[PDB]
Design a protein around this ligand. Structure first.
Ligand SMILES: O=C(Nc1ccc(F)cc1)c1cnn2c(O)cc(C3CCNCC3)nc12
Length: 274
């Protein structure tokens, strides 16, 4: 059973993704997250190498879950009558980025730079493994408060990466690009970059830039907090209306605002240890 291998703790959250609990692996006291996803709520189905019908989320996690710690790793999974249960690694202590920004307000740019860089490395990792996340946002990023390391979670809206158009989307609308809003189509990397622009704005301003469809389509960015000119430029570049006008990942990481990033541990020591 899975009830014998894991001791279940408190509910960490629930929503469109399902219900996720804190847990402990009994054999070694490893901290885990236990994620329950209802079968009736799964639309994207995938196939395992051994030829098993499994949620796409599981396929994506396995493609991504090796070694590099910028993405939360899938440790095991189980099928139940009406659901799947995923066992995931859990950092401790940890706080998600949404809560972190909520508590602290807009982040100092040195901190925003470190966090954003780490998110970029994680997304680049996903793309390298042939996985598109499709729901990059503050709630789907965990902060390891001791090591200053960020982790990307929740691949339940994700897809295999491809070079042709996507015409389906079930991620977070306020992070979705104007081409999705207007035409119900987008390409993976350029849509990802748009969401990264929303994420970076959120980090340095303490809130997302657009609320309504018409604001997304107009794409006019206003800064409500003092933000450096280099940072404003990078944000407005990621949020270009035309997907082809958006930077590549290489271009983002070579942008002047992105230079001299702190190491994760330096980041924790300066900004998180308290
Ligand atoms: O460890 C997880 N979440 C978590 C852990 C500690 C904490 F302090 C806040 C959230 C986790 C692992 N996978 N996964 C998911 O696939 C989805 C969610 C949702 C939790 C609610 N916010 C959106 C993501 N959380 C997780």
């Amino acid at each position: 059973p899975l009830e014998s291998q894991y001791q279940v703790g408190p509910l960490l959250g629930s929503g469109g993704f399902g219900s996720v609990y804190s847990g402990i692996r009994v054999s070694d006291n490893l901290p885990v997250a236990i994620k329950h996803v209802e079968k009736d709520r799964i639309s994207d189905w995938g196939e395992l190498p051994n030829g098993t019908r499994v949620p796409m989320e599981v396929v994506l996690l396995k493609k991504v879950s090796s070694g590099f710690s910028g993405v939360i790793r899938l440790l095991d999974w189980f099928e139940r009558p009406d659901s799947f249960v995923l066992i995931l690694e859990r950092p401790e202590p940890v706080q998600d980025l949404f809560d972190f920004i909520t508590e602290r307000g807009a982040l100092q740019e040195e901190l925003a730079r470190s966090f954003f860089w780490q998110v970029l490395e994680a997304v680049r990792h996903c793309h390298n493994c042939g996985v598109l996340h499709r729901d990059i946002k503050d709630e789907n990023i965990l902060i390891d408060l001791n090591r200053g390391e960020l982790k990307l979670i929740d691949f339940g809206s994700g897809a295999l990466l491809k070079d042709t158009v996507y015409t389906d989307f079930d991620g977070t609308r306020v992070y979705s690009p104007p081409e999705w809003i207007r035409y119900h189509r987008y390409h993976g990397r350029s849509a990802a970059v748009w969401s990264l622009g929303i994420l970076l704005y959120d980090m340095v301003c303490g809130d997302i830039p657009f609320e309504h469809d018409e604001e997304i389509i107009r794409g006019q960015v206003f800064f409500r907090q003092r933000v450096s000119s280099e940072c404003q430029h990078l944000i407005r570049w990621c949020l270009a209306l035309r997907p082809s006008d958006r930077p590549t990942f290489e271009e983002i990481q070579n942008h002047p605002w992105m230079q001299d990033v702190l190491l994760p541990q330096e980041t924790a020591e300066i900004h998180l240890h308290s």
